[PDB]
């Protein structure tokens, strides 16, 4: 009856013996049936892990859990599929087979393809409502959580509509998104529109832009931080401030800014180098000491968001994004890349634990694109930055990224993994388009 979530799919025995590496202890037909329900979804939790494609998941599993290991979160969803994420050429309207975060995020949040860079607008720079605005217009509580800057593409796509993702605050909008600039009659910069969106719960990094002052409007002259305060937001800066929060709703919306830029990474390690796998010692990742008890983790912010949003009888929509990574200091950083996937796995566990006992929640876990980083043989012969790592298996694993150091890792256009659990989770199985995700969520919650 109850919908289950794979309890354990680690190599079941001796990987050296026949059937030793099996992850299945028996037939799964019954399990899949039990996983299928067309019942209405009261809530939705969408976990997005930056660049977390199959290669990323495999690498993190090999390192942190062993090749035969198992993520009780990420590998735990029963229904699985592959989706396409291509963007559109702005001039021609033809596909542009390598999307950027902005266009990808616009696709699942609005359901329309658009051009790389665009946020909440199509190729005609025309606005389109987001799954989040729609949820609000139905009385559902809303949550926007990310370990990156709240102004970055993923969380912004839910609450902002600009012609360029660059338009973080006033200054930047004035020059790159003139038609969006407040002082030009526009709806304003990404941060200004975020304050208008007014989600019940918004947690993450990106407090820097909030230091900027508005150039026009009702709050002209004061910092965007001061504006949030004047508009009744509960401004929180650390773990202690966040925990003391007892409620979050439209009268007292929660806005948590936990870092100037992105939030601290989980793991630290040297970066990959030319011939690193043989010319540099094998790496063992170290914990980021900057991970204070005073700075909430992706998992803790998910927990708090769920607590606050669950108090709404009608239901809620929450988006959690695990991408504390940057560009290029974290960069071509396997250690930082791996610890990031572990961060997401923890958040996904909390989401699944909540969704399982509530029984009316659809949890969707996916990535926005795959990174060209790859797991190669210790004796690789290919050109590029490499690093050997000591995995949990007591064996070494080599990694290589096909990008130019002094250059950030590139995107690819490969269709990628999406998994779901709960009511309407079936709609992610098989091949689908990134825009189908908008429609799947819309239908599961029954939004008009």
């Amino acid at each position: 009856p109850e919908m289950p979530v794979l309890e354990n799919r680690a190599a079941q025995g001796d990987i050296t013996a026949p059937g030793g590496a099996r992850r299945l202890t028996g037939d799964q037909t019954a399990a899949l049936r039990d996983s299928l329900s067309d019942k209405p979804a009261k809530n939705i939790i969408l976990l997005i892990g930056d660049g977390m494609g199959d290669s990323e998941i495999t690498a993190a599993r090999n390192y942190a859990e062993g090749a035969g290991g198992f993520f009780k979160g990420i590998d735990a969803l029963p229904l699985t599929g592959q989706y396409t994420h291509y963007a559109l050429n702005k001039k021609t309207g033809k596909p542009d087979y390598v999307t950027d975060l902005a266009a990808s995020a616009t696709a699942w949040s609005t359901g329309v393809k658009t051009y790389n860079g665009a946020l909440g607008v199509d190729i005609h720079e025309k606005d389109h409502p987001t799954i989040l605005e729609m949820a609000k217009a139905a009385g559902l509580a809303t949550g926007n959580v990310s370990t990156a800057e709240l102004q970055d593409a993923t969380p912004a796509a839910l609450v902002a509509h600009v012609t360029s993702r660059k338009c973080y605050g006033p200054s930047a909008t004035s020059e790159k998104c003139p038609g969006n600039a407040l002082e030009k009659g526009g709806k304003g910069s990404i941060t200004e529109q975020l304050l208008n969106a007014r989600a019940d719960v918004t947690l993450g990094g990106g407090a820097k832009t909030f230091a900027e002052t508005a150039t026009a409007g009702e709050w002209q002259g004061k910092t965007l931080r001061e504006q949030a305060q004047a508009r009744g937001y509960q401004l929180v800066s650390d773990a202690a401030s966040l925990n003391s929060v007892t409620e979050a709703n439209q009268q007292k919306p929660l806005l948590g800014l936990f870092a100037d830029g992105n939030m601290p990474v989980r793991w630290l390690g040297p970066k990959a180098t030319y011939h690193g796998n043989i010319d540099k010692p094998a790496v063992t990742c170290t914990p980021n000491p900057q991970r204070n008890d005073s700075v909430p983790t992706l998992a803790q912010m998910t927990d708090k968001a769920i607590e606050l949003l669950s108090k709404n009888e009608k239901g809620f929509f929450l988006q959690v994004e695990g991408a504390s990574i940057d560009k290029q200091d974290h960069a071509a950083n396997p250690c930082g890349q791996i610890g990031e996937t572990v961060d997401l796995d923890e958040a996904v566990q909390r989401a699944l634990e909540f969704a399982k006992k509530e029984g009316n929640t659809l949890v969707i876990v996916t990535a926005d694109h795959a990174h060209a980083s790859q797991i190669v043989a210790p004796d690789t012969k290919a050109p590029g930055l490499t690093q050997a790592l000591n995995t949990k298996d007591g064996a070494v694993m080599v990694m290589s990224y096909g990008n130019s150091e002094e250059d950030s890792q590139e995107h690819t256009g490969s269709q990628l993994r999406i998994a779901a659990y709960g009511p309407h989770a079936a709609n992610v199985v098989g091949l689908t388009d990134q825009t189908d995700l908008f429609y799947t969520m819309k239908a599961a919650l029954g939004l008009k």
């Binding site: 950027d100 975060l101 790389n116 860079g117 665009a118 993702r165 660059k166």
Partner: peptide
């Protein structure tokens, strides 16, 4: 248009 851009600059 950042990922990462060119320009987005001076």
């Amino acid at each position: 248009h950042a990922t990462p851009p060119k320009k987005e600059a001076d």
